[PDB]
Amino acid sequence: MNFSLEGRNIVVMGVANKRSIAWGIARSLHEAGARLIFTYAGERLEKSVHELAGTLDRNDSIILPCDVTNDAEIETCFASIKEQVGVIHGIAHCIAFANKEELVGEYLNTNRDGFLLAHNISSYSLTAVVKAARPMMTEGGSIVTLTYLGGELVMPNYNVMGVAKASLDASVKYLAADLGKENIRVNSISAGPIRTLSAKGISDFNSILKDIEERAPLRRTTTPEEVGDTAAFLFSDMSRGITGENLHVDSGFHITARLE
Amino acid sequence: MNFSLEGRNIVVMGVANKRSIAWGIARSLHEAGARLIFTYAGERLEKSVHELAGTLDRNDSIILPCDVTNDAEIETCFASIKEQVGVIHGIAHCIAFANKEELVGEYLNTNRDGFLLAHNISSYSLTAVVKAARPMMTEGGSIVTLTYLGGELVMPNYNVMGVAKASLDASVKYLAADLGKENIRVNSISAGPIRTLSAKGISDFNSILKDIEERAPLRRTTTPEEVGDTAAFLFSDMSRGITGENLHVDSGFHITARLE
Amino acid sequence: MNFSLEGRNIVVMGVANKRSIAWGIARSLHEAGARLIFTYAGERLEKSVHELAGTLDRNDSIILPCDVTNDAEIETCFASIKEQVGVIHGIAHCIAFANKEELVGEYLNTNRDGFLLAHNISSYSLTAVVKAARPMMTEGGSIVTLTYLGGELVMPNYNVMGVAKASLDASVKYLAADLGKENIRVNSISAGPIRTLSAKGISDFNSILKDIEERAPLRRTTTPEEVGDTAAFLFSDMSRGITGENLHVDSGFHITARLE
Amino acid sequence: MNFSLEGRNIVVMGVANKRSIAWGIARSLHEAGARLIFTYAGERLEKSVHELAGTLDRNDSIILPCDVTNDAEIETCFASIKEQVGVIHGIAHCIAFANKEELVGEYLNTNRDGFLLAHNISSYSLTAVVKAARPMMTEGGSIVTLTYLGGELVMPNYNVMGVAKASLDASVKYLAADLGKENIRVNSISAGPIRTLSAKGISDFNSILKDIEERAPLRRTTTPEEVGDTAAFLFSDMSRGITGENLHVDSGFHITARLE
Ligand SMILES: NC(=O)c1ccc[n+]([C@@H]2O[C@H](COP(=O)([O-])OP(=O)(O)OC[C@H]3O[C@@H](n4cnc5c(N)ncnc54)[C@H](O)[C@@H]3O)[C@@H](O)[C@H]2O)c1
Ligand SMILES: NC(=O)c1ccc[n+]([C@@H]2O[C@H](COP(=O)([O-])OP(=O)(O)OC[C@H]3O[C@@H](n4cnc5c(N)ncnc54)[C@H](O)[C@@H]3O)[C@@H](O)[C@H]2O)c1
Ligand SMILES: NC(=O)c1ccc[n+]([C@@H]2O[C@H](COP(=O)([O-])OP(=O)(O)OC[C@H]3O[C@@H](n4cnc5c(N)ncnc54)[C@H](O)[C@@H]3O)[C@@H](O)[C@H]2O)c1
Ligand SMILES: NC(=O)c1ccc[n+]([C@@H]2O[C@H](COP(=O)([O-])OP(=O)(O)OC[C@H]3O[C@@H](n4cnc5c(N)ncnc54)[C@H](O)[C@@H]3O)[C@@H](O)[C@H]2O)c1
Ligand SMILES: Cc1c(CN(C)C(=O)/C=C/c2cnc3c(c2)CCC(=O)N3)c2ccccc2n1C
Ligand SMILES: Cc1c(CN(C)C(=O)/C=C/c2cnc3c(c2)CCC(=O)N3)c2ccccc2n1C
Ligand SMILES: Cc1c(CN(C)C(=O)/C=C/c2cnc3c(c2)CCC(=O)N3)c2ccccc2n1C
Ligand SMILES: Cc1c(CN(C)C(=O)/C=C/c2cnc3c(c2)CCC(=O)N3)c2ccccc2n1C
């Protein structure tokens, strides 16, 4: 086996701009040879994502809308993919949302509507996309989602997104147990903090990143390319023994408890 | 400090019949001296629960309806409790629901509505009850919920309830981090399987229980009284250093991987 | 069942002075009614421990030497216990040692001799004491050891003691799986930091304790009495469904990743 | 970055025959371009390992004795490596031993000598080899050891090897925290069961493997090549954000609790 993704069609869900973790993943996968299908939420991202995809050195990308709020766009999107490419070999699920005011101060700033919205977008959407993709994954495949340490432990302010990530992380395991008999693997990458659009609203994020640079074993914060290169492994056949796993790409921060 | 719960008002949520784990908890807490407030869902359980409470040797129990589907009954119920007793010292949250057809065969038998219903009842309700109880917990307190190993690992058929338990387990941690500054602890008991009303629908449950008897370190399945006696510790001052914890009351089954 | 330890003979291993965690455990167990057998290492501790035991309100304690370096004293000690009391119902194992210069700076300051000494005293000794006690635990029983979060994650300077605690924690599980068929439970308490004789040599320990007071959910550092009161639960019949478990008595610190 | 190991000198410790997991790793690393240094224990393995290395398509391998019992051979071996190649970029540590009679029946079949031997060979040796290699790892590097699920949970008969693996797993974390500031990563692969020389003595191993084929998500047992291909990722720059991690290459078995 080898690391090449030539002849693999991979859906990358969640590019918003060039700082998106999904854009780090798309670059790594394209460099490995994959043909990419980008999905975006919101008509104003369409041109953005088309332009970023156009910087890739092959012009073979497909770009499609897919809001994951309910099933309707999911069905439209995956029908297009089925007609255009026939078979899907992977999905990178890079989607999260919660109401921003719930991600400041106490976790108890959430409420039922917000809690269920965060779980719908951040956790159920993986299952919804799996459901729509499964019958087109006829040649085996690999599904990767992104999680964060605040789904395992309390991270200040992460709040209802931590609870939704814990739901996502459990779903990765149950999906992996349903799909491995069809040679479909399901894993996550637990990325360290990265200054993306989804970092806007964190207080004193510069202090968080500085502390990671001091406390993490490798003495540096995570990049989208580190995350991308681990995702290229997970979509390749090199990782075929691995499913239901959560790989921390966080400079080792997960093994530490405090800064000396 | 001591194990007594004399002078503690504890709300026990989720008695349905004498096999309920919540009924094991209520017995242990009453024996330790607590005054109990029982809550029930559905008008047909009212007389049931009143009768079971009437078997306790003090006639000081309060029995109130509290469906946790939205906030409305929660607010009514906790207002009654505030007027009747003034201060709450504990809550035992023993509530779960998912659509039964999602808890057979593949996890992918769920759907958005079912997934969000399971999360609403089985996970958000703890937060909803916490929110309504917090201003009446003026003397410090202890909150205990019930979880199951299928929120940590794949258990056949547990499916969307495992994902909802993983959300519940994360919420226990974030609640504990919000409330410890008010001397309120939040913990779970991860009970081994018990033949309750919520076991109806498990296939070959007799085989599951027999396997636990063979594989568990202590060679026996869990009882509601084992769970109750651990919950009496968690509501007592003896456990005041413990919060955010998940105590397995499962005969040791959690430490095993297979039956020799 | 009840919390009483009347009629239970419990061996408490590792009192050195009144700050020892084992002394917090002995107090709680004596208050619950247990008859205690204290063991000490080193002839200079004999009078110390006799005097502390003499402050207990019943004068029924036995005090015996037991260095755990090899098996010889273990055998002498447990033979005395067998003749004096007949049956052992519990052991509190509160023993650790590593060379102090290995617990400063890098973990790589250890060496083979030091590593194996730390493992012998801090981890194998539990197995050695279990082996000598097992045939006198004819009425069921409960064994509790003390561990620390640095066996689960990196804690600065904890170094080879963290590795030895990880060995101890695994041994708790395998012991629990061997002994549950004889109604003997084996658990640990993972205590938060306490200023004991085994804290001498930690740098800036005042800063560590202050940070725990800020970061821990309950906003306070651990006491020996908190640890003692959880150990009284673990030796009582109230905890009979629990074995192979690690209970954190740390003010909730284990669920946090950083100080906001 | 890329997956190539051209220009990387990697020490592979623990080939015994063509079924060794280390031989799966060496093949994958050689295919990725690494120059390999094989180490073996026992003069009778010398010719074995030389012959297997001679099947590789470049004849650039070095083969050296390295018994890890004490430091002496380690020092000889690493001195040879330093003179022959100058810089080490990786180590694959594939070494374990315990007395076989301790790995049948109860864990309590161990004893002090056996316990400390298992820990010395199976856990401290990683630290000993790290210590000797560190000053030759001047260009950054990656260290991979092999662990097994029985270091996380009880696996029947794994016994003192499970305790020694738990010590190894903790050492991986503390090593990673010491060495990341020198751009050296330290990780493990937790392989599923493989019929190697170290499987001789397992009872009913055919039943264990059949059960894995039924219970594991991917419905198949692990191969040395699956393990090798994950180790090629860990030694490559693609995995540079990952340290202190334990990657399960076990067909997903780690996420399951029982066979339906
Ligand atoms: N930035 C971090 O520090 C970090 C660390 C670990 C994990 N993560 C996770 O990485 C993933 C990607 O986030 P990011 O940091 O790259 O930020 P981002 O804002 O670039 O990406 C989040 C994506 O989610 C999409 N999304 C939100 N609601 C959607 C909906 N209704 N339908 C479809 N798409 C929707 C957004 O359009 C956006 O493209 C998220 O799951 C996030 O939780 C982020
Ligand atoms: N039985 C087991 O094997 C087991 C093992 C571990 C944990 N648990 C958990 O224990 C808890 C109690 O379940 P049980 O096994 O005693 O069964 P049970 O059926 O007796 O109790 C479940 C309770 O949930 C209540 N509930 C359901 N929907 C509700 C709603 N909308 N509003 C308010 N209450 C609602 C029911 O009325 C019932 O009283 C649950 O959280 C369950 O997940 C059960
Ligand atoms: N102090 C903490 O912050 C803390 C936190 C968690 C766990 N622990 C653990 O609690 C336990 C008790 O330590 P402590 O903090 O009370 O300190 P302590 O120094 O009072 O107790 C340690 C005990 O170990 C005994 N011991 C050392 N070598 C021995 C040998 N060869 N034979 C027999 N006994 C031997 C000492 O005599 C002493 O009584 C230890 O396992 C320690 O790792 C301590
Ligand atoms: N086979 C499995 O099912 C399995 C599963 C997970 C992990 N592991 C681990 O994989 C590693 C490799 O074992 P394997 O299964 O390939 O079997 P193996 O017997 O082929 O390899 C074990 C190696 O350890 C070496 N070793 C033993 N004592 C030594 C000493 N004193 N000095 C130097 N080398 C010494 C042996 O010479 C042998 O080369 C071990 O750490 C084992 O625990 C094995
Ligand atoms: C690293 C990190 C993140 C980023 N992250 C891991 C996320 O999963 C972000 C999710 C997110 C989810 N929903 C959001 C936003 C961010 C901001 C914009 C918005 O409106 N809603 C984060 C987000 C909130 C609080 C703390 C946080 N930390 C410490
Ligand atoms: C022990 C166990 C349970 C019971 N349990 C732990 C639960 O949390 C049950 C939750 C539940 C949740 N919702 C349910 C029902 C049960 C049945 C009645 C119904 O209509 N909906 C369980 C439930 C489903 C599948 C497997 C299961 N196992 C192995
Ligand atoms: C809380 C804590 C402790 C204390 N502890 C948990 C221990 O297990 C101590 C073990 C110990 C073990 N061996 C030791 C000594 C202490 C000091 C005296 C000596 O000579 N050898 C500790 C010990 C060393 C480094 C950091 C530490 N932290 C953060
Ligand atoms: C998969 C597996 C293994 C193999 N393994 C993971 C190991 O780490 C083996 C270690 C080992 C360690 N020491 C050993 C031997 C094997 C056999 C030859 C000998 O003399 N001593 C194993 C080993 C013993 C018991 C159960 C076991 N299971 C279920």
Q: H/E/C letters for each residue in chain C?
A: CCCCCCCCEEEEECCCCCCCHHHHHHHHHHHCCCEEEEEECCHHHHHHHHHHHCCCCCCCCEEEECCCCCCHHHHHHHHHHHHHHCCCCEEEECCCCCCHHHHCCCHHHCCHHHHHHHHHHHHHHHHHHHHHHHHHCCCCEEEEEEECHHHCCECCCCHHHHHHHHHHHHHHHHHHHHHHHHCEEEEEEEECCCCCHHHCCCCCHHHHHHHHHHHCCCCCCCCHHHHHHHHHHHHCHHHCCCCCCEEEECCCHHHECCCC
Token pair for residue A38? 């980008």
Backbone angles phi, psi at D63, to 5 degrees: -130, 125
Put simply, whether C250 touches D (Cβ < 8 Å) is no
DSSP class of residue B192? P
Position C133, amino acid: A
Position C91, amino acid: I
Beta bridge partners of A144: A92, A187
CB contact under 8 A, A106 and B178: yes
**Rounded distance, CA A248 to CA A190, Å?**
5
CB contact under 8 A, B240 and C226: yes
Question: Residue A229: which of A15, A14, A25, A6 has the closest Cα?
Answer: A25
Nearest CA to ligand 6 atom 16: B198
- Deposited experimental method: X-ray
**Rounded distance, CA B199 to CA B204, Å?**
11
- Strand ranges of the sheet holding D141-147, from the earlier edge strand across to the other edge: D62-65, D35-40, D9-13, D90-93, D141-147, D184-191, D246-249
**Rounded distance, CA D129 to CA C112, Å?**
11
Substitution target in D107, D117, D161 with the highest count of C β-carbons within 10 Å is D107
Q: Which residue of C has its CA nearest to A104?
A: C260
Token pair for residue B205? 């449950």
Write down the CATH number for the domain with range A1-260.
Answer: 3.40.50.720
Restricting to B residues 184-243, those with a Cβ less than 8 Å away from any Cβ of D are 208, 211
Inter-residue contact B22 to B37 (CB < 8 Å): no
Atom of ligand 5 nearest to the CA of A198: 16
Torsion angle defined by CA atoms of residues A206, D176, C118 and C50, in that order, rounded to the nearest 10 degrees: 10
Inter-residue contact B33 to B85 (CB < 8 Å): no
Q: Which residue has the tokens 């009924």?
A: B23
Position C36, amino acid: L
Inter-residue contact C168 to C145 (CB < 8 Å): yes
> Is the minimum distance from the CB of C100 to ligand 3 under 6 angstroms?
no
Put simply, whether D151 touches B (Cβ < 8 Å) is no
Q: How many Cβ pairs closer than 8 A exist between chain A and C?
A: 34
Q: Which residue has the tokens 């197995």?
A: C127
Distance (Å) of CA B3 to CA A170, B129, C186, C232: 36, 25, 22, 10
* Shortest Cα–Cα distance, B163 to chain D (Å): 13
Within 8 A by CB and 6+ apart from D69, the residues are D120, D121
User: Which residue of C110, C163, C173 is in closest CB contact with D170?
Assistant: C163
**Rounded distance, CA A48 to CA A42, Å?**
11
CA angle D148, D149, D150 (to 5 degrees): 90
Inter-residue contact C187 to B236 (CB < 8 Å): no
Residues lining ligand 6, Cβ inside 6 A: B 96-98, 100, 103, 148, 155, 157-158, 161, 193, 198-202, 208
**Dihedral of alpha carbons A146, A149, A154, A155, sign:** negative
Atom of ligand 7 nearest to the CA of C104: 25
> Is the minimum distance from the CB of C103 to ligand 3 under 6 angstroms?
no
CB contact under 8 A, D218 and A185: yes
Catalytic residue among D40, D107, D148, D174: D148
Position B207, amino acid: S
Measured in angstroms, how far is the CA atom of residue D115 from the centroid of ligand 8?
Answer: 14
Token pair for residue C201? 């040599």
Domain range list for chain B: 1-260
CB contact under 8 A, B116 and A112: no
Q: Which residue of B has its CA nearest to A114?
A: B124
Inter-residue contact B59 to B33 (CB < 8 Å): no
> Is the minimum distance from the CB of B115 to ligand 2 under 6 angstroms?
no
User: Which residue of D130, D131, D159 is in closest CB contact with C174?
Assistant: D159
b/e per residue B187-206 (b: at least 16 CB within 10 A): bbbbbbbbebebeeebeeee
**Dihedral of alpha carbons C105, C153, A169, D214, sign:** positive
Distance (Å) of CA B231 to CA A95, A128, B52, B59, B226: 39, 38, 19, 21, 9
**Rounded distance, CA B250 to CA B217, Å?**
9
DSSP class of residue A31? H
**Rounded distance, CA C139 to CA C54, Å?**
28
> Is the minimum distance from the CB of C197 to ligand 3 under 6 angstroms?
yes
Atom of ligand 7 nearest to the CA of C156: 26
Q: Which residue has the tokens 């959300």?
A: B167
Measured in angstroms, how far is the CA atom of residue A35 from the centroid of ligand 1?
Answer: 22
Which ligand places an atom closest to the C-alpha of B161?
6
**Rounded distance, CA B36 to CA B6, Å?**
11
Nearest CA to ligand 6 atom 19: B100
Which amino acids of B are annotated as binding site for NAD(+), given as ranges? 14, 20-21, 67-68, 95, 165, 194-198
Inter-residue contact B34 to B62 (CB < 8 Å): no
**CA end-to-end distance (rounded Å), chain D:** 43
Position D23, amino acid: W
CB contact under 8 A, B108 and A130: yes
**Rounded distance, CA D177 to CA C109, Å?**
13
Show the 3-state SS of C27-96: HHHHHCCCEEEEEECCHHHHHHHHHHHCCCCCCCCEEEECCCCCCHHHHHHHHHHHHHHCCCCEEEECCC
Beta strands, E only, A67-198: 90-93, 141-147, 184-191
Nearest CA to ligand 6 atom 28: B158
Burial of residue B150, with CB atoms counted within 10 A of its CB: 0-12 exposed, 13-18 middle, 19 or more buried: buried
DSSP SS3 for D116:
helix
**Rounded distance, CA A181 to CA A166, Å?**
25
**Rounded distance, CA C76 to CA C66, Å?**
8
**Rounded distance, CA D204 to CA D199, Å?**
11
CB contact under 8 A, C153 and A260: no
User: Which residue of A225, A237, A243 is in closest CB contact with D218?
Assistant: A243
Inter-residue contact C99 to C114 (CB < 8 Å): yes
Conformational region of residue D8, where left means phi above 0, alpha means psi within -120 to 50, and beta covers everything else: beta
